[PDB]
Design an enzyme around this catalytic site. Structure first.
Site, short mmCIF file in Angstrom:
data_model
loop_
_atom_site.label_atom_id
_atom_site.label_comp_id
_atom_site.label_asym_id
_atom_site.label_seq_id
_atom_site.Cartn_x
_atom_site.Cartn_y
_atom_site.Cartn_z
N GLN A 105 0.79 -1.23 0.00
CA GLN A 105 0.00 0.00 0.00
C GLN A 105 0.82 1.29 0.00
O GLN A 105 0.25 2.37 -0.09
CB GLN A 105 -0.93 0.07 1.22
CG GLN A 105 -2.04 -0.93 1.21
CD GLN A 105 -2.37 -1.35 2.67
OE1 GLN A 105 -3.27 -0.80 3.29
NE2 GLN A 105 -1.57 -2.28 3.23
N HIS A 123 -1.87 0.83 -4.26
CA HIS A 123 -2.24 2.28 -4.28
C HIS A 123 -1.40 3.10 -5.28
O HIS A 123 -1.41 4.32 -5.24
CB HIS A 123 -2.21 2.86 -2.86
CG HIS A 123 -3.19 2.18 -1.95
ND1 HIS A 123 -3.07 2.15 -0.58
CD2 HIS A 123 -4.29 1.42 -2.24
CE1 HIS A 123 -4.05 1.44 -0.05
NE2 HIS A 123 -4.81 0.99 -1.04
N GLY A 198 3.86 -3.96 9.16
CA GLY A 198 3.75 -2.51 9.29
C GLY A 198 2.44 -1.92 8.81
O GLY A 198 2.43 -0.93 8.06
N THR A 199 1.30 -2.48 9.25
CA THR A 199 -0.01 -2.07 8.68
C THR A 199 -1.15 -1.57 9.66
O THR A 199 -1.21 -1.98 10.80
CB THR A 199 -0.52 -3.14 7.66
OG1 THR A 199 -1.60 -2.59 6.89
CG2 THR A 199 -0.97 -4.37 8.41
N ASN A 224 4.62 -6.52 13.61
CA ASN A 224 4.28 -5.17 14.00
C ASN A 224 4.71 -4.73 15.39
O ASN A 224 4.84 -5.54 16.35
CB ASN A 224 2.79 -4.99 13.90
CG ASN A 224 2.43 -3.72 13.21
OD1 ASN A 224 2.52 -2.61 13.78
ND2 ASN A 224 2.03 -3.86 11.94
N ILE A 225 4.89 -3.41 15.49
CA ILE A 225 5.25 -2.78 16.78
C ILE A 225 4.08 -2.77 17.80
O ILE A 225 4.21 -2.16 18.85
CB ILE A 225 5.82 -1.32 16.58
CG1 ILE A 225 4.75 -0.37 16.01
CG2 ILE A 225 7.05 -1.33 15.69
CD1 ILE A 225 5.05 1.11 16.18
#
Ligand SMILES: [Zn+2]
Lengths: 263, 7
Positions: A105, A123, A198-199, A224-225
């Site tokens: 994206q 995108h 990372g989303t 992910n964080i």
């Protein structure tokens, strides 16, 4: 709806070792350590000068078409934007024969810049521009997005035909290309591990693809964080980690690849 | 309709 488990990076290395066809699904979190803020509501940043209700939407483009250009211009001119360690890791993972494609994206081109070879850009991409009267396409590069370029001199940029250039990215309110989606869907259809990296928060796009990956009864890992919309709904495992700690996974897999000397 | 939208 289902029960997600926490795993370590060391443990993800092992999941990927068994695998033949891994796909990475990536969101803005993977460009954060390249200097582009994902939060988007941070005041420590660019997104601040500009109202996302105008630059982010297709209603906003037709009323103020200069605004998405300003934003792209200031991000390109005012920040040092380089491939990070996470991008290098993903590139290695392809090299070693694990990662078959990247569905993304982001519109910033970094995955390609790092050497990935099958990047599906859902995108679109800030390095092309289309005239929104005659559909002439113009290719751009980083240097043309600088505040001092002739192409940025007068905004929005103008086609010879008399129309106006629009960046070739998909804004809120627009429709993602059905062809590009079928591409992404088929790459997921054949995969044996989806990495979701990372989303947020999300956008319909990544979400719909995870739903599709569940439909196809596929194995899903978040890196992910933090927890996200799909944690405890759609992901099988979750690794709490920054995109760039992924070079630890690439390290473990490259050195095991050195089972390479005779004897 | 695969509209880009806020989640
Ligand atoms: Zn034109």
């Amino acid at each position: 709806k289902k029960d997600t488990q926490s795993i370590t990076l060391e443990e993800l290395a092992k999941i990927i070792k068994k695998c033949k066809h891994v796909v990475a699904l990536t969101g803005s979190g993977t460009s954060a350590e390249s200097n582009i803020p994902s939060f988007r509501g941070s005041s420590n940043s660019i997104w601040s000068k500009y109202d996302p209700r105008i630059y982010g939407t297709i209603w906003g483009f037709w009323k103020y078409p200069e605004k998405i250009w300003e934003v792209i211009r200031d991000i390109s001119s005012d920040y040092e934007i380089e491939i990070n360690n996470g991008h290098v890791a993903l590139s290695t993972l392809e090299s070693l024969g694990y990662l078959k494609s990247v569905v993304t994206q982001n519109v910033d081109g970094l995955h390609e810049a790092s050497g990935n070879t099958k990047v599906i850009s859902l995108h679109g991409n800030v390095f092309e521009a289309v005239c929104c009267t005659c559909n002439k396409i113009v290719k751009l590069n980083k240097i043309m997005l600088q505040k001092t370029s002739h192409f940025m001199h007068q905004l929005p940029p103008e086609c010879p035909c008399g129309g106006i250039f629009k960046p070739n990215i998909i804004l809120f309110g627009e429709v993602v290309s059905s062809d590009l989606l079928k591409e992404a869907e088929e790459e997921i259809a054949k995969c044996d591990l989806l990495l979701v990296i990372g989303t947020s928060s999300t956008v319909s796009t990544a979400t719909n693809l995870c739903h599709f990956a569940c439909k196809k009864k596929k194995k899903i890992v978040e890196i992910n964080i933090s927890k996200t919309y799909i944690t405890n709904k759609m992901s099988d495992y979750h690794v709490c980690a920054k995109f760039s700690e992924l070079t630890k996974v690439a390290n473990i897999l490259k050195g095991s690849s050195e089972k390479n000397k005779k004897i | 309709t695969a509209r880009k939208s806020t989640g």
